[PDB]
RNA sequence: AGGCGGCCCCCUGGACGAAGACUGACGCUCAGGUGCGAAAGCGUGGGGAGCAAACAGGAUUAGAUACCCUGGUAGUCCACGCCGUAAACGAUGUCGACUUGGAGGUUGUGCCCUUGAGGCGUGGCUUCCGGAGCUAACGCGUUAAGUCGACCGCCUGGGGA
RNA sequence: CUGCAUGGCUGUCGUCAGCUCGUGUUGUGAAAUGUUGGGUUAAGUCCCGCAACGAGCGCAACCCUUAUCCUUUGUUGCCAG
RNA sequence: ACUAUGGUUUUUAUU
């Protein structure tokens, strides 16, 4: 019901007088491992507080999507602003695979096997959103409720 | 000459309404209701038009 | 509520072009809502409100629209509920982690009147100490004991209360609203035909909604 | 389209509106090709009030080959052609079409003897906000940068260019 | 020798009233917000009020002192009874 | 606004 994962904590490069400002920025993802996921960013003067703020920004930003027991239901395409993704299910003996945002956002969505690549813009706060569209494009196996019954 | 009032003057001083003592600029902000003025003094008007 | 799934119509001019799927025309010069939707739209709302109140699910009544600012308690204490009628200062339900301190500031503003000089003097600090104390004591008096979040929200006007309906959409809470042919049905989860201006409408119509929560409390 | 208003008469390609018909896929777009110049430029004359590149000087200044002033050729105008290019701008290719509202300009048209000191409907074009939707932002939004189908052209770093 | 290495000491705009933080809102984001608005003061001084609500630092206040009062003491002073 | 009118201060170790 609440599963959380970190992508990166980094130091900001903004110069103020005698050096680069003493702050830390964190990028995170949060979900329920079965049909909801969201992304968040946060800043602080210490590493734990940057994560504490980012994880809450992710928990307040969740989107509803469909999975098939931690496996992809079909090969699926995702798009966002100046970026694209493609994802497909794996075969036996493979499944991990992937890095950056894809190693995080899919693990809080319950996914245990994937084959995937990201295209266009390289910024992880853009790649994660093409990956969320690349989940929201996937068709549900759920029996809700008359169209395909049952 | 494009004047508002003229001919029988010849005056040592000229004055005419709503053209001196500045009355602004940008005074109708946060919010300046002027108690009752826009209710009459902006009926016609209609030359902005609108746009 | 009050007069069953029947229609009467309200107002003779200016209605919302988004209400086309619910308007049925004019009858006795007023515009009227389709009877064939009036009947079920009442029933599905009262049947869920009965169930929420049966889970002991806390109902919050909003009365920031002047006609309901007293009826939000005086017509609603007929059941177990909570009430608000002042401005929310933002985040009143979405920022509880920081807004819960307002009840402790209401506690601290009373402790500032514990001075030995406050008893013996008559006007010196007697009004200075009350500028926030007697406004927090009024605005929180129907919600301070709750200690958490409501599970349903009830509004008299979905355009006047919209700054609170925004917070309900951030928490996924179902909002129950009164609607007319000039209302807009977006951001609200249950909608019932009515008004707040004939005359003297909410004085008994809101009592018939508190009656639903009273049946949820058996 | 570029653009086109001092006025009157003659000629002349189309435009928009209300209501129908008969023909009967004849259509929509287009490499090359065909037709159209804003202003400046050219050829041959006419015309020459001013204005006016360049020119000769004043004055300002350290300077004045700028601004201001004194004088001024080509050009501007008319007739017939050459030149073919532009921030040629809604920077929205050409065509067909869908989908809420609001405050305005301009102009056809249906009906009522306007109760009376009126208007309500209904086409075309345009202005500024703006919904559903979009975009990096600013903007667009029934005159779409939105969603759909058809055709033709162009672009792949800057400095050199 | 070195205050472009460090603690301490210390200057001035100025004794000017200003500088910011935690959380919500907005923006993709650096950030914007609150501190802006409306009365008033020497003064973000004191109040009113908003998608902002709350908060520290400085400001003002203590103390030094002047116009008086309560009180005690007196030569080497002052010198009336 | 009638104040008619206008140019420099080295690239290079630093705020």
Curated annotation (Swiss-Prot), chain A:
Impact after mutating residue 11 to L: In strain: SPCR9; spectinomycin resistant. Not a ram mutation
Q: Which GO terms describe its molecular function?
A: rRNA binding; structural constituent of ribosome
Keyword annotations = Acetylation, Antibiotic resistance, Ribonucleoprotein, Ribosomal protein, RNA-binding, rRNA-binding
Give Gene Ontology CC terms. cytoplasm; cytosol; cytosolic small ribosomal subunit
Q: Does the keyword Heme apply?
A: no
- Listed Pfam families: Ribosomal_S5, Ribosomal_S5_C
Q: What does this protein do?
A: With uS4 and uS12 plays an important role in translational accuracy. Many suppressors of streptomycin-dependent mutants of protein uS12 are found in this protein, some but not all of which decrease translational accuracy (ram, ribosomal ambiguity mutations).
Q: What is known of its domains?
A: The N-terminal domain interacts with the head of the 30S subunit; the C-terminal domain interacts with the body and contacts protein uS4. The interaction surface between uS4 and uS5 is involved in control of translational fidelity.
The protein's name in its UniProt record: Small ribosomal subunit protein uS5
Question: Which lineage ranks, top first, belong to the organism behind this chain?
Answer: Bacteria, Pseudomonadati, Pseudomonadota, Gammaproteobacteria, Enterobacterales
Gene transcribed to yield this protein: rpsE
Curated annotation (Swiss-Prot), chain B:
Got a GO cellular component term for this one? cytosol
In this chain, composition skew of type Basic residues spans 43-51
Key words, A-Z: Ribonucleoprotein, Ribosomal protein, RNA-binding, rRNA-binding
Q: Which GO terms describe its biological process?
A: cytoplasmic translation; ribosomal small subunit assembly
According to its UniProt entry, this protein's organism is Escherichia coli (strain K12)
What is the official name of this protein in its record? Small ribosomal subunit protein bS21
Per UniProt, subunit arrangement is:
Part of the 30S ribosomal subunit. In stalled ribosomes contacts ribosome rescue factor SmrB.
Family membership, please give it: Belongs to the bacterial ribosomal protein bS21 family.
> What is the recorded function of this protein according to its Swiss-Prot or TrEMBL entry?
Probbly involved in recognition of ribosome rescue factor SmrB in stalled/collided disomes; fusion of protein fragments to its N-terminus decreases ribosome rescue in the presence of SmrB.
GO MF terms, alphabetically ordered = rRNA binding; structural constituent of ribosome
UniProtKB/Swiss-Prot annotation, chain C:
Taxonomic superkingdom: Bacteria
Print the organism lineage. Answer: Bacteria, Pseudomonadati, Pseudomonadota, Gammaproteobacteria, Enterobacterales
Q: How does it assemble?
A: Part of the 30S ribosomal subunit, contacts bS1. Some nascent polypeptide chains are able to cross-link to this protein in situ. In collided ribosomes contacts ribosome rescue factor SmrB.
Q: Which GO terms describe its molecular function?
A: structural constituent of ribosome; zinc ion binding
Matches recorded under SUPFAM superfamilies: Ribosomal protein S2
Cellular component GO terms held in the UniProt record: cytoplasm; cytosolic small ribosomal subunit
PROSITE patterns named among the record's database cross-references: RIBOSOMAL_S2_1, RIBOSOMAL_S2_2
State its role: Required for ribosomal protein bS1 (rpsA) to bind to the 30S subunit.
Gene giving rise to this polypeptide: rpsB
According to UniProt, the name of this protein is Small ribosomal subunit protein uS2
- GO terms for biological process, alphabetical: cytoplasmic translation; ribosomal small subunit assembly
The chain residues annotated with the modification N6-succinyllysine are 107
For this protein, the record's Pfam families field holds: Ribosomal_S2
Family per record: Belongs to the universal ribosomal protein uS2 family.
Q: Which InterPro entries match?
A: Ribosomal_uS2, Ribosomal_uS2_bac/mit/plastid, Ribosomal_uS2_CS, Ribosomal_uS2_flav_dom_sf
Q: Which UniProt keywords apply?
A: Ribonucleoprotein, Ribosomal protein
Native source species:
Escherichia coli (strain K12)
Q: Which PANTHER family match?
A: 30S RIBOSOMAL PROTEIN S2 PROKARYOTIC AND ORGANELLAR, SMALL RIBOSOMAL SUBUNIT PROTEIN US2M
């Amino acid at each position: 019901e609440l599963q959380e994962k970190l992508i990166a904590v980094n130091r900001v490069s903004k110069t103020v007088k005698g050096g680069r400002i003493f702050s830390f920025t964190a990028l995170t993802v949060v979900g329920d491992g079965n049909g909801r996921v969201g992304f968040g960013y946060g800043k602080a003067r210490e590493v734990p507080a940057a994560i504490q703020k980012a994880m809450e920004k992710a928990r307040r930003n969740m989107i509803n999507v469909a999975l098939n027991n931690g496996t992809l239901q079909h090969p699926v395409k995702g798009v966002h602003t100046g970026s694209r993704v493609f994802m497909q299910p794996a075969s036996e003996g493979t499944g991990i695979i992937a890095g950056g945002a894809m190693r995080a956002v899919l693990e809080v969505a319950g996914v245990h096997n994937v084959l995937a690549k990201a295209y266009g813009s390289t910024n992880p706060i853009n790649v994660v959103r093409a990956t969320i569209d690349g989940l929201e494009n996937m068709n549900s196996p759920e029996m809700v409720a008359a169209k395909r019954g049952k | 000459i494009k004047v508002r009032e003229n001919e029988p003057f010849d005056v040592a001083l000229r004055r005419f309404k709503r053209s001196c003592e500045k009355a602004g600029v940008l005074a109708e902000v946060r919010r300046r209701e002027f108690y009752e003025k826009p209710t009459t003094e902006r009926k016609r008007a209609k030359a902005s038009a609108v746009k | 509520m009050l007069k069953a799934g029947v229609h009467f119509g309200h107002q003779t001019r200016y209605w919302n072009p988004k209400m086309k799927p619910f308007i049925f025309g004019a009858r006795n010069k007023v515009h009227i809502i389709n009877l064939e939707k009036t009947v079920p739209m009442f029933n599905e709302a009262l049947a869920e409100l009965n169930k929420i109140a049966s889970r002991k699910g806390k109902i919050l009544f909003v009365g920031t629209k002047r006609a309901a600012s007293e009826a939000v308690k005086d017509a609603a204490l007929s059941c177990d509920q909570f009430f608000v009628n002042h401005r929310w200062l933002g985040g009143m339900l979405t920022n509880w982690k920081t807004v819960r301190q307002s009840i402790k500031r209401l506690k601290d503003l009373e402790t500032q009147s514990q001075d030995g000089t406050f008893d013996k003097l008559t006007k010196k600090e007697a009004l200075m100490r009350t500028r926030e104390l007697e406004k927090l004591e009024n605005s929180l008096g129907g919600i301070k004991d709750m200690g958490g979040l409501p599970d349903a929200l009830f509004v008299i006007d979905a355009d006047h209360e919209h700054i609170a309906i925004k917070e309900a959409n951030n928490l996924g809470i179902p909002v129950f609203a009164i609607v007319d042919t000039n209302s807009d049905p977006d951001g609200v989860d249950f909608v019932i035909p009515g008004n707040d201006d004939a005359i003297r409408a909410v004085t008994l119509y809101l009592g018939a909604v508190a009656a639903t929560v009273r049946e949820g409390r058996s």
